Amino acid sequence: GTSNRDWWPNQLDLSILHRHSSLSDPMGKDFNYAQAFEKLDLAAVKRDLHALMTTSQDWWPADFGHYGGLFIRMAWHSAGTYRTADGRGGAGEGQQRFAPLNSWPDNANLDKARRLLWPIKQKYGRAISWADLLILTGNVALESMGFKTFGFAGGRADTWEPADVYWGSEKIWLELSGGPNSRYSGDRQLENPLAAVQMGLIYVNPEGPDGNPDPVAAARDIRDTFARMAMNDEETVALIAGGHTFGKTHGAGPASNVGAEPEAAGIEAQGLGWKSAYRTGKGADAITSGLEVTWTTTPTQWSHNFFENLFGYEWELTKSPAGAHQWVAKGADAVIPDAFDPSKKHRPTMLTTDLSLRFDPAYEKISRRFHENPEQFADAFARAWFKLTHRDMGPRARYLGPEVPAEVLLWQDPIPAVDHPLIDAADAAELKAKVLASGLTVSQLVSTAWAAASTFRGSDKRGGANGARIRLAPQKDWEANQPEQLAAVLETLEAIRTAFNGAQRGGKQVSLADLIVLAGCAGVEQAAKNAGHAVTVPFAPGRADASQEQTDVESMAVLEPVADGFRNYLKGKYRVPAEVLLVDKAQLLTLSAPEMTVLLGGLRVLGANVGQSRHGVFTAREQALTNDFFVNLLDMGTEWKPTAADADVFEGRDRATGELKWTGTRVDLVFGSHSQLRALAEVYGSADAQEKFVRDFVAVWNKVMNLDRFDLA
Amino acid sequence: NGTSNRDWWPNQLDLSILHRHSSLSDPMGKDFNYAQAFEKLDLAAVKRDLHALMTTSQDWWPADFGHYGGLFIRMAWHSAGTYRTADGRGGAGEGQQRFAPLNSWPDNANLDKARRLLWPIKQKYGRAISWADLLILTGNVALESMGFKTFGFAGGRADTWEPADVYWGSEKIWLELSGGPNSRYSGDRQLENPLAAVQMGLIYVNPEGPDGNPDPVAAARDIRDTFARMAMNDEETVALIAGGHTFGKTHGAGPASNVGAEPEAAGIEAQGLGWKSAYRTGKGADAITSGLEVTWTTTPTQWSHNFFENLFGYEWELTKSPAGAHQWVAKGADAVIPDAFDPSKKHRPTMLTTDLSLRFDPAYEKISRRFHENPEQFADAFARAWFKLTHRDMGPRARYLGPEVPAEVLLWQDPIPAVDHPLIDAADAAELKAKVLASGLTVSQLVSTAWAAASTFRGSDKRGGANGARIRLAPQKDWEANQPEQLAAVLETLEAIRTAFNGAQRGGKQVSLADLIVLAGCAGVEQAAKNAGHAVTVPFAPGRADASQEQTDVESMAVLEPVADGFRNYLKGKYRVPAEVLLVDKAQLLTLSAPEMTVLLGGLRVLGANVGQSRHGVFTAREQALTNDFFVNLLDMGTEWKPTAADADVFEGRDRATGELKWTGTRVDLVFGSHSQLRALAEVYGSADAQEKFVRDFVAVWNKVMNLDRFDLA
Ligand code: HEM
Ligand code: HEM
Ligand code: NA
Ligand code: NA
């Protein structure tokens, strides 16, 4: 059947904002995963997982009699889709069980691994999510094989539909770079927000870049992709060598023997795929990647044999039985066990990408340190494995269960504990009046609180106003945050704070994080009063203030808003139209289309635009909270045309006289163009809508202010 | 553009249709009730404002003849005109003309203008009048302004907030003529169900003639077919076409190549409008809409009997408009038709091919002549047909709101008689459930009968459902999916219970068969829970009434026959669309989400609801017990599944280790173990902590289905 996307393939896509509705969720509206998980007998689950490890199923027999390498790969791929650019991907939603990830070529045969876990999932039901179970299974694999993990936290609630993630524009799986939808340009520059070299890969190609078996060039791709997943060189080496201490690859025959991926497979395959016609199609005959490498002499036991082999041999370029490029140790004896025939041994083998860890000079230094000092290796891998598998989990307040590591890690964006009584409702009223008596304006207050709170992204639960990181580097100097204006606001609020905190008894104090948000709340109430309407904006205390030393400035970079349509801001010129970036921002903020619409129309009239731009400020009562954005946008008495200077800026003129009334950007005018968004704008621009507009604006503002408040969850 | 799952797997089933229209996309609060808003609207004030608008010409789209009435009648007829009786989809009832694709169909060109003219009134009255109501009300006021007395009007069409998911065809080219790679025609001009238009982007037919051939006789065939697929017979069809074309004009002042992008394709600066034209002033006298240039009557802004005087009073010659389209001009006629803008110009009478159909098709000619000779008959038929057109998708009369609702009950409304007696109470319900369970009717029989009765409902046009007890009447009683012999036996037993209970009452209390069928079904579900060891309560609301055969139009009922009902593992024949797609379509008509579809189907399988007692998907050894066995067995990896060599749509589930046959299933059964989203939902209900959740969710969805048509309780 032909669909709107067929007819109008470039039209904006709002359905990404309405995913994850109560309609698609099988759990009741009142289900709380954390409450379920907190009563799970986690130790029982781990005993069942430990037993599974060596309980082979004949439909996918265990290599070496142990599923631990398969499950480590499964967990690494669950986490391994994460990109720092947008926070999207990662293990936190269990999306490996849905399309497309369940059918990526790099996820081949992980369908088998997840099917092996259905009995346990069935047994414990809603008390352990698939998302949590994939990671826990990887940890138990590690522990069953003699590796001491760093810990584990539960709390990843399951999702029920595919996420809407941009994974690239190629139309062919695994397409090599330089096609019509190439994700590379320039001198091998990978397009943001992507963090993989080919469509359907986790990070890099195991043969080498676009299949060229050069370990030195492959290392460049490794470094780039892993940095786009928030991993540095030490962590990268630790992870790759750690993982490839275990198990094996599968390439026993030609790939043409492997059939349809799960989403393409017949109904009878019951959710599995990659059925293979090569011999038995499984076990000793399995084909996954097409490579046939076994790294260590004890694939089912932690060891330091990976680096012993890597540095103890020179390596020769060869082909697997499927024709893939891979490496074999020169002159070596047959010392590696076969996965099924106890009478057969094999030479040491390596991937191109493994040899990267010796042949890239910076990696070699780390690898040599880890080979000489395997205890350093083990501790770096434990820490990296916990970061890999937790990087999208959000604040430590979300971590559940008895195995949470106590050590606070800089990458967690930690927030200090609160050790003092909080302000009450009368205190909050006192502080709102003091803020308004200071002379800070509605625009100042709104804009500051907006800046602080709107760094949140629901993709990885980073950002938000908790921490008061807006006062620290690098947030205080981001262009969108108007650094000179911001510093003046913060100085005034810090003086209010000092004065209130100095008058208290009992140890009650207010943090700057809370006062920044409360102050914005006062600005919204004041704006409403300027419009002739008394409203109270909700406020929940309990945010704390992080220090500079507790803030990783490099990792915070990815949270800079380079496009924030809510402030009519674009840092530079992008290929993607500004309205598309607005809906992307809205999705990261967890807003629906109605919420996005009200929020933006209110922010325009409040003075939230960066630089005090008049674009979209369709009011003569700026700093009053009215629906004037919508009534003026929708007025057919005004005609709009792009300016000669800038096609992305439009003038609104009176249709009869030509007199200039307004200017606006694409982000402003989309609300009067897109048929769905216009329908929303009409509700808030109707003559009965003043009360509704204010109430819904207050509700969405409070939602934004609370996005990172998992202490209140 | 970014690659999507639909790009990778373009045939994989689409569940998002079941989760449209969530609370997320709706700007109104979850407790907004449009009916309550509407009932406090000052409808008379609205109508005065509409009357004023008719002659308030805007310079960006100047009014023909100084009166927007013809544009607004066309706007309202196109709002209603997308309706198809096959699935009940389309029509005016959701205001979908303001969203894609309908807002940009070629046949809806310049109706963007019409809607924009109505924004000030919409703004002024806000939530108290929906767009969907306002489009039809405007059409009514246009007719009244121009001297035609309407049959009435009902409000209550709530607005919707995103595009509906309707199959409009498979063509990938607007307006494609027939016989292409995605043709909606095969055979001897057989239009594919559920479609009710000849070309992609048309309302019904091509005004030049079939595939552009200007033959009024063959055009008539397309008209009859498409109109019938919109629930309209010959009398109604002639009344509507001639009634409509009593007003206004078409627009074709220059070549079509002058007309730019439709609204969904236009630039942001167009602010939601489209079809900007570079021909002269682009508007008014110079307007280009269809490409045809026809004005039917000597008074295009006043109700008249001139359409049929012209149609029969002249012989007609084939000509071309200024844009090159085929149309007809009256041979020898004087210039008697006014110009829309220049008082000094007059024009000869002109007609479309499809208008000439009403004279050259022999059946239509007889009706046309009758209307020409008896203009009061014409007026009354058009009034009634205009009301039907604009209300056919509104559902039971209980939904109709406001002071202008016609009192007359019309057959097409599938009327249900008023209840005029006390209803059964809770003690009575318990007494009747006990009687039913003591009769020896089985769980299977009770569940199946109530399912059959209630699951005819479809939310597209709000037809069907268990109210009325139409399952006992023709044609429902004879539908294959309803198991006519079994059904007769059940109905005879329930009628005997009914008669015995009703005969013992005082005070006028009685129970309808419609309620008893539903109550008996509830008792079946209760019994099945008991058989599983579980206490359970199934909610029941009395108040259904029994309709008569005479209140039940058998031909209109035919389109409600389930030819595919995955919930009973039924498919009447072989179809091109795979059975699991048909299941999701049926769930959409039933208003079910994916979790509800899932739980419902797995429970109905174990209760014995399958047609013919088929064992397909009956994955239990305790049939007639309400358990989650369907899910636990479907998900057991100890079973391997393969299609049979006899029928590739039937699968055998064998023990993986022995080969022993354990079960058989269809595509509708197995999709729950294959589709990645459906399987996720099956896993919840197949978990060891899920038995009570399954029962409680099943009871809820069952009750939901039993009450779908209960707009008396709304
Ligand atoms: C440059 C990065 C990496 C590359 C190119 C890569 C590549 C691959 C490939 C091609 C396979 C074989 C799949 C198959 O045929 O079955 C595989 C297996 C595996 N990988 Fe990696 N890998 C990378 C990093 C990792 C990381 C970070 C971990 C975990 C910490 C990991 C753990 C594993 C394990 C445990 C296996 C064995 C699976 C089994 O025994 O079934 N790898 N790797
Ligand atoms: C066989 C069925 C029909 C066909 C092929 C048809 C075709 C058309 C076409 C091509 C136009 C010209 C559009 C333009 O260029 O502006 C039009 C105009 C119009 N039609 Fe029909 N029509 C049909 C039935 C209807 C019905 C059922 C009604 C309403 C009861 C209706 C009412 C109108 C009116 C009032 C106009 C004039 C619009 C104006 O003045 O702007 N027509 N029709
Ligand atoms: Na994420
Ligand atoms: Na409909």
From Swiss-Prot, chain B:
Task: Quote the record's cofactor note.
Answer: Binds 1 heme b (iron(II)-protoporphyrin IX) group per dimer.
PTMs? Answer: Formation of the three residue Trp-Tyr-Met cross-link is important for the catalase, but not the peroxidase activity of the enzyme.
User: What range does the record give for the signal peptide?
Assistant: none
Covalent link (Tryptophyl-tyrosyl-methioninium (Tyr-Met) (with W-91)) residue numbers: 204-230
Q: Which cofactor does it need?
A: heme b
What residues form the catalytic site here?
78 (proton acceptor)
Return the CDD domains for the record.
catalase_peroxidase_1 (cd00649), catalase_peroxidase_2 (cd08200)
Q: Which Gene3D superfamilies match?
A: 1.10.520.10, Peroxidase, domain 2 (1.10.420.10)
Per the UniProt entry, what are the Gene Ontology biological process annotations, in alphabetical order?
Answer: cellular response to hydrogen peroxide; hydrogen peroxide catabolic process
Q: Which GO terms describe its molecular function?
A: catalase activity; heme binding; metal ion binding
Role played: Bifunctional enzyme with both catalase and broad-spectrum peroxidase activity.
Protein name (Swiss-Prot/TrEMBL): Catalase-peroxidase
* Gene expressing this chain: katG
